[PDB]
Design an enzyme around this catalytic site. Sequence first.
Site, PDB file in Angstrom:
ATOM      1  N   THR A 250       0.821  -1.208   0.000  1.00  0.00           N
ATOM      2  CA  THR A 250       0.000   0.000   0.000  1.00  0.00           C
ATOM      3  C   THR A 250       0.866   1.274   0.000  1.00  0.00           C
ATOM      4  O   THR A 250       0.458   2.306  -0.526  1.00  0.00           O
ATOM      5  CB  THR A 250      -0.943   0.011   1.228  1.00  0.00           C
ATOM      6  OG1 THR A 250      -0.204  -0.389   2.374  1.00  0.00           O
ATOM      7  CG2 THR A 250      -2.119  -0.983   1.054  1.00  0.00           C
ATOM      8  N   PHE A 375      -6.573   4.545   6.655  1.00  0.00           N
ATOM      9  CA  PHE A 375      -5.889   3.586   7.527  1.00  0.00           C
ATOM     10  C   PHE A 375      -6.850   2.815   8.433  1.00  0.00           C
ATOM     11  O   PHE A 375      -6.432   2.351   9.503  1.00  0.00           O
ATOM     12  CB  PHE A 375      -4.826   4.271   8.397  1.00  0.00           C
ATOM     13  CG  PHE A 375      -3.724   4.885   7.614  1.00  0.00           C
ATOM     14  CD1 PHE A 375      -2.717   4.095   7.062  1.00  0.00           C
ATOM     15  CD2 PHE A 375      -3.707   6.265   7.389  1.00  0.00           C
ATOM     16  CE1 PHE A 375      -1.674   4.686   6.315  1.00  0.00           C
ATOM     17  CE2 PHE A 375      -2.671   6.854   6.659  1.00  0.00           C
ATOM     18  CZ  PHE A 375      -1.667   6.066   6.121  1.00  0.00           C
ATOM     19  N   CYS A 382      -4.746   0.694  11.101  1.00  0.00           N
ATOM     20  CA  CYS A 382      -3.412   0.348  10.643  1.00  0.00           C
ATOM     21  C   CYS A 382      -2.375   0.578  11.728  1.00  0.00           C
ATOM     22  O   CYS A 382      -2.258   1.678  12.260  1.00  0.00           O
ATOM     23  CB  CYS A 382      -3.061   1.212   9.424  1.00  0.00           C
ATOM     24  SG  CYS A 382      -1.407   0.826   8.846  1.00  0.00           S
TER      25      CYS A 382
HETATM   26  C1  HEM Z   1      -0.036   4.042   2.930  1.00  0.00           C
HETATM   27  C2  HEM Z   1       0.132   2.801   3.411  1.00  0.00           C
HETATM   28  C3  HEM Z   1      -0.900   1.983   4.210  1.00  0.00           C
HETATM   29  C4  HEM Z   1      -2.254   1.960   4.126  1.00  0.00           C
HETATM   30  C5  HEM Z   1      -3.188   2.803   3.226  1.00  0.00           C
HETATM   31  C6  HEM Z   1      -2.739   1.008   5.117  1.00  0.00           C
HETATM   32  C7  HEM Z   1      -4.063   0.704   5.366  1.00  0.00           C
HETATM   33  C8  HEM Z   1      -4.571  -0.145   6.322  1.00  0.00           C
HETATM   34  C9  HEM Z   1      -5.977  -0.445   6.598  1.00  0.00           C
HETATM   35  C10 HEM Z   1      -7.207   0.141   5.877  1.00  0.00           C
HETATM   36  C11 HEM Z   1      -6.013  -1.303   7.626  1.00  0.00           C
HETATM   37  C12 HEM Z   1      -7.272  -1.908   8.283  1.00  0.00           C
HETATM   38  C13 HEM Z   1      -7.707  -3.143   7.498  1.00  0.00           C
HETATM   39  C14 HEM Z   1      -9.053  -3.653   7.970  1.00  0.00           C
HETATM   40  O1  HEM Z   1      -9.806  -2.906   8.654  1.00  0.00           O
HETATM   41  O2  HEM Z   1      -9.381  -4.839   7.659  1.00  0.00           O
HETATM   42  C15 HEM Z   1      -4.643  -1.604   8.006  1.00  0.00           C
HETATM   43  C16 HEM Z   1      -4.248  -2.485   8.985  1.00  0.00           C
HETATM   44  C17 HEM Z   1      -2.976  -3.000   9.163  1.00  0.00           C
HETATM   45  N1  HEM Z   1      -1.797  -2.524   8.586  1.00  0.00           N
HETATM   46 FE1  HEM Z   1      -1.721  -0.893   7.322  1.00  0.00          FE
HETATM   47  N2  HEM Z   1      -1.641   0.448   5.742  1.00  0.00           N
HETATM   48  C18 HEM Z   1      -0.501   1.006   5.210  1.00  0.00           C
HETATM   49  C19 HEM Z   1       0.790   0.705   5.597  1.00  0.00           C
HETATM   50  C20 HEM Z   1       1.181  -0.289   6.483  1.00  0.00           C
HETATM   51  C21 HEM Z   1       2.552  -0.575   6.914  1.00  0.00           C
HETATM   52  C22 HEM Z   1       3.802   0.213   6.441  1.00  0.00           C
HETATM   53  C23 HEM Z   1       2.504  -1.615   7.773  1.00  0.00           C
HETATM   54  C24 HEM Z   1       3.670  -2.307   8.532  1.00  0.00           C
HETATM   55  C25 HEM Z   1       4.817  -1.688   8.902  1.00  0.00           C
HETATM   56  C26 HEM Z   1       1.098  -2.010   7.884  1.00  0.00           C
HETATM   57  C27 HEM Z   1       0.617  -3.045   8.653  1.00  0.00           C
HETATM   58  C28 HEM Z   1      -0.691  -3.247   9.016  1.00  0.00           C
HETATM   59  C29 HEM Z   1      -1.127  -4.264   9.937  1.00  0.00           C
HETATM   60  C30 HEM Z   1      -0.237  -5.295  10.629  1.00  0.00           C
HETATM   61  C31 HEM Z   1      -2.642  -4.094  10.043  1.00  0.00           C
HETATM   62  C32 HEM Z   1      -3.615  -4.905  10.912  1.00  0.00           C
HETATM   63  C33 HEM Z   1      -3.582  -4.170  12.256  1.00  0.00           C
HETATM   64  C34 HEM Z   1      -4.536  -4.856  13.200  1.00  0.00           C
HETATM   65  O3  HEM Z   1      -5.699  -5.118  12.802  1.00  0.00           O
HETATM   66  O4  HEM Z   1      -4.125  -5.151  14.339  1.00  0.00           O
HETATM   67  N3  HEM Z   1       0.330  -1.196   7.086  1.00  0.00           N
HETATM   68  N4  HEM Z   1      -3.791  -0.872   7.198  1.00  0.00           N
END
Ligand code: HEM
Length: 437
Positions: A250, A375, A382
Amino acid sequence: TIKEMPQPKTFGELKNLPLLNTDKPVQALMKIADELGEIFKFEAPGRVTRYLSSQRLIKEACDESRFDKNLSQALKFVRDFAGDGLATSWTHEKNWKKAHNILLPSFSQQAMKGYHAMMVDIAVQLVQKWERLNADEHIEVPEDMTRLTLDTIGLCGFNYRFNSFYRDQPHPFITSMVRALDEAMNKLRQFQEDIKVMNDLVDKIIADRKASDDLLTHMLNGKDPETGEPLDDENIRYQIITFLIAGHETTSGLLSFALYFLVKNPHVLQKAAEEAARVLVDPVPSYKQVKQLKYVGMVLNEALRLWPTAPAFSLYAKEDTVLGGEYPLEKGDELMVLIPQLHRDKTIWGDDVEEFRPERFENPSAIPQHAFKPFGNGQRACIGQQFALHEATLVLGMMLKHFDFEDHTNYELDIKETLTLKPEGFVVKAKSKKIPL
Ligand code: HEM
Ligand SMILES: [Zn+2]
Ligand SMILES: [Zn+2]
Ligand SMILES: [Zn+2]
């Protein structure tokens, strides 16, 4: 008084399923929402989802007292290889809270400061690559952003160097990743083969660490404060896979869409390049300087507004309830948050929603709660958000200090969908401003 909710064309037993016979289902859904408004029902055989597009309905959906994270059918397919990793766990699955508590320290401010030098390492490799192109050559934007962002989480998270800038095709692991994620999207020996590749590298990462303070340190050695238990071996490996994908894909899309918008809006690019030149007085950006790149941060939020690279997230009703004073839901009903439509809600943003204007984000306190959700939401939002934005800000600032850009093909935007969004075929030429680093 109960409203009956809109639903697109059905096809007998297949219901609405055939309407997403497309390589671009999220974009197809956006068109349906344009036609039908703030909510529509979408049915498949043995599947129902309600797609939401207004801030008005989405703010209700984001009430955690009333709705929890759902594993969409997409995430259910991703779970085939990411298992009960943080992104693909139910909130009350034992390993969600457990891994959350163990891994939070790795996204603390000290961790971030610690990460900065290693982000700079990979960003320098990107800038060097572009400084070293010959006059007749061009840049494949999403391909290089993917090199950058994979390498960054590999290094920061795991002290593992994918060495993506040393290879003319994508790293084995990427090629297998895009193929499994494309399968999971379509599904809605090859798939087991893609998972083979992914899992062979995970072992190489753990084994290499066995030869002796980052994400992996914590995965391997952190204990849940609530119990004193560390993560088990199976979950840890799910986490490594989780962070490898979520940690780069992403972000690579964001940097791609961001450069896209800057080249299509040269005065915005100008304004961002002036800040970069003004702030970034040192050979590489300091942690503090990156924080001073305000306009560059606004550029990234605006890019996430128009094209949120994780386009959707899914919730379920915790009990029988009514959404928006109008639509009854049963316990367990799935709501899907259609982020690019939320982000185009004119009642929130004004009529100019298609225009790229980072100035929208000047006073972030002016933005209504739940208007801007690239996010995700609440406790399941996120975990890597600050990591992604520091990386993207760092890198974009350095791109803007070091190069003037030329949209030499007059690129027509073409958004490839896997589960995430990215510009496909985005190419530019970069002319060095000749400032060494
Ligand atoms: C611009 C970049 C990013 C966007 C737009 C983004 C977006 C999101 C979104 C929408 C969710 C929620 C998903 C859901 O509700 O099912 C999420 C969760 C998550 N993201 Fe990101 N993300 C980004 C970058 C990252 C990065 C750099 C990492 C790791 C270093 C990461 C790791 C995670 C993890 C592990 C979750 C699950 C968290 C949880 O539910 O405990 N993401 N992200
Ligand atoms: Zn709950
Ligand atoms: Zn530590
Ligand atoms: Zn009921």
